[PDB]
Design a protein around this ligand. Structure first.
Ligand code: A1B3R
Ligand code: ZN
Length: 139
């Protein structure tokens, strides 16, 4: 679990969004596993605006942060589950690093700020949904 709070917005994994998130929906993209809902309070997370391929992510299944090298956002494969059937996930970045179910929502950060959130992973790999292209989160 986990979310990003920037201004009057809450960014969560679309498969983990609550009834409240859907009742205050701003934007969602099933292919990206993202959903953004509105909030009454002001968020202070800084979104990174860069092309970094190194950063640190929080791994709840180990209560630890890990440094990782990650790929550029791209279209990659995901099987099925209570949430989606096989499809290409867009805007996804992979890194070699520990993850298993429950780890979705952990933040990936670089020196410039928030890069993305854990969304998938498998056999020793972890997948992050990028948020750096969503320029409207700041305005
Ligand atoms: C860190 S998730 C993980 C890691 C290792 C193993 C298994 C998982 C769970 C997982 O991969 N999924 C269930 C939730 C939806 C995911 C796709 C989202 O577009 C797929
Ligand atoms: Zn950066």
């Amino acid at each position: 679990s986990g979310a990003i709070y920037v201004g009057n917005y809450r960014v969560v994994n679309r498969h983990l969004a609550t009834h409240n998130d859907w009742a205050n929906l701003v934007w969602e993209d099933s292919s990206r596993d993202l959903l953004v809902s509105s909030t009454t309070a002001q968020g202070c997370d800084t979104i990174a605006r860069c092309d970094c391929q190194t950063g640190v992510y929080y791994c709840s299944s180990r209560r630890k942060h890990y440094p990782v090298s990650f790929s550029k956002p791209s279209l990659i494969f995901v099987e099925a589950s209570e949430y989606y059937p096989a499809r290409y996930q867009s805007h996804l970045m992979l890194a070699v690093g520990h993850s298993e179910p429950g780890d979705c929502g952990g933040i990936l950060r670089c020196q410039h700020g928030v890069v993305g959130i854990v969304s998938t992973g498998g056999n020793g790999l972890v997948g992050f949904a990028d948020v750096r292209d969503l320029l409207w989160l700041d305005e």
